[PDB]
Amino acid sequence: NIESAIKRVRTSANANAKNSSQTNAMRTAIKKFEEAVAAGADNVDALYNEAVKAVDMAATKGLIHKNKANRDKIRLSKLAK
Template sequence: MPNIESAIKRVRTNENANALNSSQLSAMRTAVKKFEQAVEAGADNVADLHQAAVKAIDMAETKGLVHKNKANRDKSRLSKKIAK
């Protein structure tokens, strides 16, 4: 445990940032999984779920949670699945 006041504050802010980052990354993964399950089931709302998944990926990329190339790769894979 740090003794210096600024280091104590950094620990606090890092915990808050980690919680926000983790929740946003989890939301991205959940959106992608919902889309993939809908494609397999042949649901009617596949286009809406695709749009939500792409938005979640873009937001995670903007925040620096995933690399640009990974985001593009994931979006490309989702687009391939919707094209089938």
Template sequence: MPIIKSAIKRVKTSEKAEARNASQLSAMRTAVKKFDKAKVAGADNLEDLYKAAISAIDHAKAKGLIKANKAARDKSRLAARYNK
């Protein structure tokens, strides 16, 4: 545990950021999994889930949670599954 006041604050801040980032990354993965599950089941709201998944990927990229190439790759794979 740090002793210096600024280091103590930094630990608190980084823990909050880590929790927030994990939550947002989890939300992105959940959106993609919901789309995949609906695609297999042949659900009616497939287009809405597709848009939500794309939006979640874009949001994660904008927040710096994933890199641009991963976002592009994920969106490309998602589009391929959507059109198949």
């Protein structure tokens, strides 16, 4: 039988769509950053700094809950030099 839980199926499916979209945006941002740091070509700092700041913009909007975002910025700060 189904009574009113079929509301929650549609709700959770839409939440799947937007949550997976935003987190894949975050992961490709971090991938772009890590490929940028290992390059070491011209513009090694300025596009790096724009990438750092865009990554942090994406991170604090994001969700783990609150904790391992700080771990990400700790392991991200040590990846400068």
